[PDB]
Design an enzyme around this catalytic site. Structure first.
Site, mmCIF file in Angstrom:
data_model
loop_
_atom_site.group_PDB
_atom_site.id
_atom_site.type_symbol
_atom_site.label_atom_id
_atom_site.label_comp_id
_atom_site.label_asym_id
_atom_site.label_seq_id
_atom_site.Cartn_x
_atom_site.Cartn_y
_atom_site.Cartn_z
ATOM 1 N N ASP A 35 0.855 -1.192 0.000
ATOM 2 C CA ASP A 35 0.000 0.000 0.000
ATOM 3 C C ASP A 35 0.883 1.233 0.000
ATOM 4 O OD1 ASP A 35 -1.904 1.888 0.285
ATOM 5 O OD2 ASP A 35 -2.427 1.376 2.349
ATOM 6 N N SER A 199 -0.604 15.650 -11.982
ATOM 7 C CA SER A 199 -0.819 15.289 -13.379
ATOM 8 C C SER A 199 -1.067 16.557 -14.208
ATOM 9 C CB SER A 199 -2.032 14.349 -13.476
ATOM 10 O OG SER A 199 -2.434 14.078 -14.790
#
Length: 330
Positions: A35, A199
């Site tokens: 994770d 992004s």
């Protein structure tokens, strides 16, 4: 040193991925959910409340000659999905794919929430976010990666998740055979303890690319792609009969649909998520309503590039003094 381990989907939907991890002496092999959005290595154990264990493999510290109680240490964690666990702490030897750390904090669960009990395939979590998020008190502990780092050939690990197939976690090296083209690196903020990046924009299907900054985290422990409601609405508007269902808890679409791809930007580069990756199947067994893999992040307080997005790429988690992320097509 290096390590290399195969990661395997837990079910036919890629709801999560499990990686075998050796703990203790002699080795006890548990299948852990790696994770990158949390920082605790915790396991089902001989200490876990018996009614909360249903098929998981447990760690038994009393059977490990290298296990030591970390006296006075406790831990307690709450995840984004509402799940939780807590317990006490041992140090022990932990190996992943041939890479060994001695003295790793192994957080033994005394209590786990219902979603953990109900998932017999996941024996615990191995956190790979920054050690500033580790919940051990009163002495915060290091992740497996942070303890391994100085010994590794290069201070990196890579995630190469499969679509409906196994993939790979590598530590200490970048497998230049595992991706196509070049790796585009992008800046990371560690201010929230995550692999947080920005992004450069998105496209829906064959549509034009929208240049827009989307801050979010690279999180292998989250199944879906969670983005701003504007982006998500633009995606699902291209699917006839898709709608946001408050009763189901997100966007659903007719199971008869063919889904468009979704592209996200990494600097000037582009990662394309095929439409099929966005199909999470019937909402209930036999339904013709299917659950979408792209969902709104509104109310979560962060955008999450979870497995839907990461499995479309070869991802480099660069833990150099200034961390960065890398993405390549594959």
């Amino acid at each position: 040193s290096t390590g290399s381990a195969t990661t395997t989907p837990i079910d036919s939907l890629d709801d999560a991925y499990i990686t075998p991890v050796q703990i203790g002496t002699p080795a006890q092999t548990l299948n852990l959910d790696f994770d990158t959005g949390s920082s605790d290595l915790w396991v089902f154990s001989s200490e876990t409340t018996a009614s909360e264990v249903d098929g998981q493999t447990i760690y038994t510290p009393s059977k490990s000659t290298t296990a030591k109680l970390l006296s006075g240490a406790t831990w307690s964690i709450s995840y984004g999905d509402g799940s939780s666990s807590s317990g006490d702490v041992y140090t022990d030897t932990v190996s992943v794919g041939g890479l060994t750390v001695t003295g790793q904090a192994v957080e033994s669960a005394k209590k786990v929430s219902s979603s953990f009990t109900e998932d017999s395939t996941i024996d615990g979590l191995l956190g790979l976010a920054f050690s500033t998020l580790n919940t051990v008190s009163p002495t915060q502990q290091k992740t497996f990666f942070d303890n391994a780092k100085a010994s590794l050939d290069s201070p990196v690990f890579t995630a190469d998740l499969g679509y409906h197939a196994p993939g790979t976690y590598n530590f200490g090296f970048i497998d230049t055979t595992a991706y196509t083209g070049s790796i585009t690196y992008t800046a990371v903020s560690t201010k929230q303890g995550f692999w947080e990046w920005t992004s450069t924009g998105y496209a829906v299907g064959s549509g034009t690319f929208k240049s827009t900054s989307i801050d979010g985290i690279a999180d292998t422990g989250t199944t879906l792609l969670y983005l701003p409601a504007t982006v998500v609405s633009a995606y699902w508007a291209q699917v006839s009969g898709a709608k946001s269902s408050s009763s189901v808890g997100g966007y659903v679409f007719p199971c008869s649909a063919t889904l468009p791809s979704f592209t996200f930007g990494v600097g000037s580069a582009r990662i394309v998520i095929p439409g099929d990756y966005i199909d999470f199947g019937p909402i209930s067994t036999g339904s013709s309503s299917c659950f979408g893999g792209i969902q709104s992040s509104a109310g979560i307080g962060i955008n999450i590039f979870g497995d839907v997005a990461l499995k479309a790429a070869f991802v480099v988690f660069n833990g150099a003094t200034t961390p960065t992320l890398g993405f390549a097509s594959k």
